mmCIF file of C-alpha atoms (C1' of nucleotides) in Angstrom:
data_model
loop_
_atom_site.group_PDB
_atom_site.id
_atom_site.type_symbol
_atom_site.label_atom_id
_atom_site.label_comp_id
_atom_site.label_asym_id
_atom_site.label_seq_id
_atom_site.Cartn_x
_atom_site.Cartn_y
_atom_site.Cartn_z
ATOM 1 C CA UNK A 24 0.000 0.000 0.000
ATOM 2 C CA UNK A 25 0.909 3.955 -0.594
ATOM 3 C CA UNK A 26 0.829 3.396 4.167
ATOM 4 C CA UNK A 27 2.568 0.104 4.440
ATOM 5 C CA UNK A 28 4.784 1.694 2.315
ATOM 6 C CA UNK A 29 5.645 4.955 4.281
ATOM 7 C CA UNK A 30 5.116 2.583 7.682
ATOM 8 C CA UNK A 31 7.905 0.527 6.405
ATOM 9 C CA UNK A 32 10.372 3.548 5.973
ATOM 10 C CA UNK A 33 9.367 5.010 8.961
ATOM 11 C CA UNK A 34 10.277 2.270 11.036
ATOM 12 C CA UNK A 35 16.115 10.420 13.938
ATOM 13 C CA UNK A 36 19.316 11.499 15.743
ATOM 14 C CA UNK A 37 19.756 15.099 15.333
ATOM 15 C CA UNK A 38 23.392 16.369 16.867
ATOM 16 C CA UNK A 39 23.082 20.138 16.502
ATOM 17 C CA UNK A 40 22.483 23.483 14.541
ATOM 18 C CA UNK A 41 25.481 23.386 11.810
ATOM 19 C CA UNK A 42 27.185 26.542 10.969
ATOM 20 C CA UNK A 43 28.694 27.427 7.319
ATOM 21 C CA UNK A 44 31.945 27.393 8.751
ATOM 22 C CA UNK A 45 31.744 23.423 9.329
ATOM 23 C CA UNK A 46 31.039 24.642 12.910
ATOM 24 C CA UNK A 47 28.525 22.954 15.368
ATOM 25 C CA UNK A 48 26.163 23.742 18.037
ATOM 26 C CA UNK A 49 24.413 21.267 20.553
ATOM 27 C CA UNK A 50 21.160 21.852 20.792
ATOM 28 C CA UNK A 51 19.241 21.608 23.375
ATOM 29 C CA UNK A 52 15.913 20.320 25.810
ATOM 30 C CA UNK A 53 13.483 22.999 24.285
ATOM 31 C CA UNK A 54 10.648 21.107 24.009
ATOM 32 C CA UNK A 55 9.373 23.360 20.866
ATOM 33 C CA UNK A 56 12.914 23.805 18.598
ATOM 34 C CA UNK A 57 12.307 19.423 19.089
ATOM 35 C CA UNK A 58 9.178 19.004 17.532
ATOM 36 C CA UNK A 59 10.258 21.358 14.245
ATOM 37 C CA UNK A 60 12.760 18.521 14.175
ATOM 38 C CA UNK A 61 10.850 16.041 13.977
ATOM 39 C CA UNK A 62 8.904 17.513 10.882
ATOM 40 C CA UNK A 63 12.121 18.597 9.083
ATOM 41 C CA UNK A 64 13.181 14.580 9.147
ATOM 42 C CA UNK A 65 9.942 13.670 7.912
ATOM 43 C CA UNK A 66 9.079 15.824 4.992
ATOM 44 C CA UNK A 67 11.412 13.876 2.518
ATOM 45 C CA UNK A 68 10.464 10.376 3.622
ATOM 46 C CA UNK A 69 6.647 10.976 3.110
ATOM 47 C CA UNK A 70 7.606 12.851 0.162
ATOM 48 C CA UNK A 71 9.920 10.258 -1.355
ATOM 49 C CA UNK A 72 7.667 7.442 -0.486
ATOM 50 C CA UNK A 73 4.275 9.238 -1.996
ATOM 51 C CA UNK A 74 6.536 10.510 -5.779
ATOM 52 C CA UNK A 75 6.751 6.445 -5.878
ATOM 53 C CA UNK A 76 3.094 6.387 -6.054
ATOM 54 C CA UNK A 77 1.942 9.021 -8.009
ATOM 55 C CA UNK A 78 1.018 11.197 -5.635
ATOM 56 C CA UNK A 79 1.644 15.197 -5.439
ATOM 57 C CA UNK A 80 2.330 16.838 -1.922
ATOM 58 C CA UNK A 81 1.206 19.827 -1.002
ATOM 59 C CA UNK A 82 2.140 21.845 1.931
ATOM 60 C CA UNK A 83 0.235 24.922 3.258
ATOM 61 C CA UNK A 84 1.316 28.293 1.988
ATOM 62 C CA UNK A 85 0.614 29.549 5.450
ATOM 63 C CA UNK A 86 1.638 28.460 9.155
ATOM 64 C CA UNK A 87 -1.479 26.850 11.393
ATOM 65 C CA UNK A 88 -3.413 25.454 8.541
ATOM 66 C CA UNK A 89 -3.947 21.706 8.286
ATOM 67 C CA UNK A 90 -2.397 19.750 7.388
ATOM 68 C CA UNK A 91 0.972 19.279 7.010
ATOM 69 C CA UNK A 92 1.275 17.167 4.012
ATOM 70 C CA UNK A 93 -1.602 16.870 1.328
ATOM 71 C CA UNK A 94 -1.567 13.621 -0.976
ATOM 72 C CA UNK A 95 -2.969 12.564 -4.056
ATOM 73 C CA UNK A 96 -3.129 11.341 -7.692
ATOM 74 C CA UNK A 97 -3.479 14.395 -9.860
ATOM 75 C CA UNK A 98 -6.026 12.154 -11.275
ATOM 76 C CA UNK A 99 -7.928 12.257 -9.111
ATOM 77 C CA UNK A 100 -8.814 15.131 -6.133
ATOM 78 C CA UNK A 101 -12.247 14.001 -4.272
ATOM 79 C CA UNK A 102 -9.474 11.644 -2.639
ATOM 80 C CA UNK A 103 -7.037 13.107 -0.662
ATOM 81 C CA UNK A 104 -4.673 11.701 2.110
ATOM 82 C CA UNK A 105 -3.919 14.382 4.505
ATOM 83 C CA UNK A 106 -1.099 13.969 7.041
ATOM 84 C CA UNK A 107 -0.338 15.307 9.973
ATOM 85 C CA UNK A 108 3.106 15.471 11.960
ATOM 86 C CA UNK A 109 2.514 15.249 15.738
ATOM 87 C CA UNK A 110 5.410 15.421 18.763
ATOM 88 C CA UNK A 111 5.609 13.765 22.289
ATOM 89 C CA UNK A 112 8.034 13.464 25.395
ATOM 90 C CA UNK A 113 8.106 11.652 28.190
ATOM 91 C CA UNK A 114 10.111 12.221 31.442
ATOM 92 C CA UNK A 115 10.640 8.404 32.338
ATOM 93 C CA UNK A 116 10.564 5.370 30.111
ATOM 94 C CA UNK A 117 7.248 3.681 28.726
ATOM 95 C CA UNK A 118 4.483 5.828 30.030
ATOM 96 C CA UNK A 119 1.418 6.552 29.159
ATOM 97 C CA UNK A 120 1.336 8.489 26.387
ATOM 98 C CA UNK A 121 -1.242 11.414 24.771
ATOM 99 C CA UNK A 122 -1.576 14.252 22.545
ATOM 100 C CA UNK A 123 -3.416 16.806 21.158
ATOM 101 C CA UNK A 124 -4.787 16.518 17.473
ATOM 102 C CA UNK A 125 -6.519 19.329 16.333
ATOM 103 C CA UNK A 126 -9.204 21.531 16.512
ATOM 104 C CA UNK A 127 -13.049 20.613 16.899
ATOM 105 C CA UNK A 128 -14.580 23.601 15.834
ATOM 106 C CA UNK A 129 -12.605 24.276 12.480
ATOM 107 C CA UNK A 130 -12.928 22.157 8.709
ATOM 108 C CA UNK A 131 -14.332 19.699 11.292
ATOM 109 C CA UNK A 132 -17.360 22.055 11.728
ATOM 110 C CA UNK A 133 -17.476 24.154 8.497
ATOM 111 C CA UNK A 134 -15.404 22.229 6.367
ATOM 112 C CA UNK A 135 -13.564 24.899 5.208
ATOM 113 C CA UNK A 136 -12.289 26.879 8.332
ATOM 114 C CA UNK A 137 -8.162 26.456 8.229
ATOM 115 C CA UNK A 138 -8.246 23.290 6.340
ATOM 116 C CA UNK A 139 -5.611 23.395 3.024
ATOM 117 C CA UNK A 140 -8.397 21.748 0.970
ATOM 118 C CA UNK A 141 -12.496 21.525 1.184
ATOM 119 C CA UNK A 142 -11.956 18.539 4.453
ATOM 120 C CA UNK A 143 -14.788 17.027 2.222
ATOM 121 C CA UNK A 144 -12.592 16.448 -0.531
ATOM 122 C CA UNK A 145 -10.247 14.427 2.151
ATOM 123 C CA UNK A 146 -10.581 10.452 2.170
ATOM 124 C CA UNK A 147 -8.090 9.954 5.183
ATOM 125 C CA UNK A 148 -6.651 11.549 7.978
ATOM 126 C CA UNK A 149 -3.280 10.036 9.343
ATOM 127 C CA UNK A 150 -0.783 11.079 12.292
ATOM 128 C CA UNK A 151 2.808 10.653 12.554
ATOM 129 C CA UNK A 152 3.382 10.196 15.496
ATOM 130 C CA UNK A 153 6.837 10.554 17.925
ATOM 131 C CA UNK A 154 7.566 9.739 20.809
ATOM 132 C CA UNK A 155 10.687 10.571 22.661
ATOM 133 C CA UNK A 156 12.264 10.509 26.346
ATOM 134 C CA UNK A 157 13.300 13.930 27.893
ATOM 135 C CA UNK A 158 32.261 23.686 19.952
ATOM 136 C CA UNK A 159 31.928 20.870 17.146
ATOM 137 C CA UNK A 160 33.712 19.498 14.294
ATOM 138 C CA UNK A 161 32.594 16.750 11.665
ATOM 139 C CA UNK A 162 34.222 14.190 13.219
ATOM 140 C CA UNK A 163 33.137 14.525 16.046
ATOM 141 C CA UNK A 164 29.453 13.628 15.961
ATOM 142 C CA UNK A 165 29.664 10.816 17.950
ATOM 143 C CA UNK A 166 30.747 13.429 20.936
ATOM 144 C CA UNK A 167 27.475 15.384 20.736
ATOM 145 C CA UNK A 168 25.174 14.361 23.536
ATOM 146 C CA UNK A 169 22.239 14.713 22.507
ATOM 147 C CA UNK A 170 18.707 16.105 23.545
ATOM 148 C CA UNK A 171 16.616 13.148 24.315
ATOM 149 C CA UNK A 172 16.537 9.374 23.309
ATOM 150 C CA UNK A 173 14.813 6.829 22.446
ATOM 151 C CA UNK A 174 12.707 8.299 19.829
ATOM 152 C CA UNK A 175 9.547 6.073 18.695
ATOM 153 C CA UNK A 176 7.220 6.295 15.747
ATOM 154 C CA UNK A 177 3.674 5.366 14.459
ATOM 155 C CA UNK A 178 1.763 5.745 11.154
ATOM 156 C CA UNK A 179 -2.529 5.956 12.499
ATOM 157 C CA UNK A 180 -5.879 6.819 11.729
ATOM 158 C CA UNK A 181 -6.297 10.111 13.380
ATOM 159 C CA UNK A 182 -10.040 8.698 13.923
ATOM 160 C CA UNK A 183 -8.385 5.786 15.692
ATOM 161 C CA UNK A 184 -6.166 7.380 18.366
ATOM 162 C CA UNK A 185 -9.051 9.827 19.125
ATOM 163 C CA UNK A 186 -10.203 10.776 22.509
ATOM 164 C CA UNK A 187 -13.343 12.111 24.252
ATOM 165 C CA UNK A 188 -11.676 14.945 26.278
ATOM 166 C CA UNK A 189 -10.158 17.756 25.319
ATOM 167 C CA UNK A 190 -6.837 18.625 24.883
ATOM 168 C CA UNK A 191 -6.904 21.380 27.836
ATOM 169 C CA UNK A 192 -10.738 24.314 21.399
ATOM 170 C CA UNK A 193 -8.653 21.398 20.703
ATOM 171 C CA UNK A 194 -9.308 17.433 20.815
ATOM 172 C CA UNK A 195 -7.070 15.155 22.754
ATOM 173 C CA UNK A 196 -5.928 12.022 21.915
ATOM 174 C CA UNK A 197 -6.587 8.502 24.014
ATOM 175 C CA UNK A 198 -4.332 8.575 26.883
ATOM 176 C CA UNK A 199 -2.226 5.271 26.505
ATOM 177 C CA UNK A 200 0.882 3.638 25.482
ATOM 178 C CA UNK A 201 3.038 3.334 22.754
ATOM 179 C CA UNK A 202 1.367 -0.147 21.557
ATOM 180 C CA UNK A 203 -2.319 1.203 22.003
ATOM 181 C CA UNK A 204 -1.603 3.415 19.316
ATOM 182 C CA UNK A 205 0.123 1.398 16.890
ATOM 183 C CA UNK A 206 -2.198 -1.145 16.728
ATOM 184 C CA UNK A 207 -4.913 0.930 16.807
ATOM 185 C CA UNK A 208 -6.996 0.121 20.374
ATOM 186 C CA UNK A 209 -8.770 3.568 20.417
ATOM 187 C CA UNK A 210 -12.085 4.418 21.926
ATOM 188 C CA UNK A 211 -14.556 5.467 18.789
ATOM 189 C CA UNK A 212 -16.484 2.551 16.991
ATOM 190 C CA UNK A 213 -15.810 4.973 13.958
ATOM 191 C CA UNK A 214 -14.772 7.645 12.197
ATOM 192 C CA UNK A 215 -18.730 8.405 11.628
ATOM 193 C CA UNK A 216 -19.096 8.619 15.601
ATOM 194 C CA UNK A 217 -16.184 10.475 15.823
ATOM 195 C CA UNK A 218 -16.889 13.079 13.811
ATOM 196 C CA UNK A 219 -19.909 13.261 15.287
ATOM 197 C CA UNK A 220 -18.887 13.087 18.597
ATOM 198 C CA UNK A 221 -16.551 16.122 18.161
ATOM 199 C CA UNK A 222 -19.020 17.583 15.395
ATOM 200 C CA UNK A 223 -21.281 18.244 18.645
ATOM 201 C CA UNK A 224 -18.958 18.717 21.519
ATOM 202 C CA UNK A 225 -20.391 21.531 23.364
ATOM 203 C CA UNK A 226 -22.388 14.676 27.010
ATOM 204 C CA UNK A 227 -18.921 14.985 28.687
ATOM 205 C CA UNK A 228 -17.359 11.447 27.233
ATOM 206 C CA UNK A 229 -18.278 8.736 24.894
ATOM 207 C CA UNK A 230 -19.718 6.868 27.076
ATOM 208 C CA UNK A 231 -22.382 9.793 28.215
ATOM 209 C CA UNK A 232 -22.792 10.351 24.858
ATOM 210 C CA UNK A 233 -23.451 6.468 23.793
ATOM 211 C CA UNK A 234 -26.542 6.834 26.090
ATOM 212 C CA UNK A 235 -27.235 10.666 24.420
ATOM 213 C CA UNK A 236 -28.495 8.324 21.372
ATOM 214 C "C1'" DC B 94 -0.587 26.593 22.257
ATOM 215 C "C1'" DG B 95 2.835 24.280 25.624
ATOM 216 C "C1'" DA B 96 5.071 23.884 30.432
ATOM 217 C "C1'" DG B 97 6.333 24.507 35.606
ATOM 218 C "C1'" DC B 98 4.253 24.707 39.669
ATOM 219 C "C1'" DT B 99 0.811 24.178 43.573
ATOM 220 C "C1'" DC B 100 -2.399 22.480 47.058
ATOM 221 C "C1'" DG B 101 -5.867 19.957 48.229
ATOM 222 C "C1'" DC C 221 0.392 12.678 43.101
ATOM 223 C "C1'" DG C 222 -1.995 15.048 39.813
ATOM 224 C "C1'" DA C 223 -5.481 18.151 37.682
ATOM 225 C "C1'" DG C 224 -5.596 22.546 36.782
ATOM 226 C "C1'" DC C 225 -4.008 27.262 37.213
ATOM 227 C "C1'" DT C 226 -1.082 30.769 35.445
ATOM 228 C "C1'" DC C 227 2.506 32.310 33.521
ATOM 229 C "C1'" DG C 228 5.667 32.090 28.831
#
DNA sequence: CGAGCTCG
DNA sequence: CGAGCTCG
């Protein structure tokens, strides 16, 4: 498939910020220069892996507009693969995971508020996901200590991984482990219910809202 | 939006 | 110990 595909390659050391001069700088424990990182090492896999299946990528022309990466067959535009690069850290070593994937009140709503494309004309929604635990010369990058370790990753249904509650407008994902989300043991029975779920998120959880019906 | 801190 | 407040 155009996923098993990108899963595959998927399956992210960075040692500093380089300078012209062959010079380089350590970064650091900023939790926000990290997940830019983690979206400059991606956008050449998912692009090489899509240009081997026909697919052009767009990217928005402007910051805080989803997603990051628009796919499809030029063929073809009522079926578009939008993905979305999300970022997570943990302080000790296999928690319990969570994160925060969007916005309920946006495309979700209007279908047209900050989404790149009409979200209508969008077949699926999928999330990268990473996980990771909180002078220079050339030769030396094996000196560089670096910034965190023990990165993890995880192609999903943004559907799938899903919660109820909210992030702290935006939706937060189930709170779980690494291997909840890979295989995919969310909370929804569907994308249907949860889009509608979120669609009318003013019930206080799915299970409240279960009974709503 | 994300993160350090607090107080019950 | 952790949900939430409050500050960046």
């Amino acid at each position: 498939s155009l996923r098993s595909d990108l899963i595959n390659a998927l399956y992210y050391d960075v040692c500093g910020i380089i300078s012209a001069e062959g010079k380089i700088y350590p970064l650091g424990s900023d939790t926000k220069v990290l997940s830019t990182i983690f979206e400059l090492f991606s956008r050449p896999i998912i692009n090489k892996i899509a240009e081997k299946h026909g697919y052009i990528v767009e990217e928005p022309k402007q910051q805080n507009h989803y997603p990051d990466f628009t796919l499809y067959k030029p063929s073809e535009p009522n079926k578009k693969i939008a993905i979305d690069i999300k970022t997570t850290y943990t302080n000790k070593e296999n928690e319990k995971i969570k994160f925060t994937l969007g916005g309920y009140t946006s495309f979700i709503r209007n279908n047209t508020k900050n989404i790149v494309y009409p979200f209508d004309q969008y077949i699926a929604h999928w999330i990268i996901g990473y996980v990771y635990t909180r002078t220079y010369n050339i030769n030396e990058l094996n000196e560089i200590p670096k910034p965190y370790k023990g990165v993890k990753v995880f192609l999903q249904d943004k559907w799938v991984i899903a919660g109820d509650l909210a992030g702290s407008t935006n939706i937060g994902s189930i709170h779980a482990h690494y291997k909840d989300f890979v295989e995919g043991k969310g909370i929804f029975d569907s994308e249907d219910e949860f889009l509608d779920y979120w669609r009318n998120y003013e019930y206080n959880n799915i299970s409240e809202y279960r009974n709503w019906i």
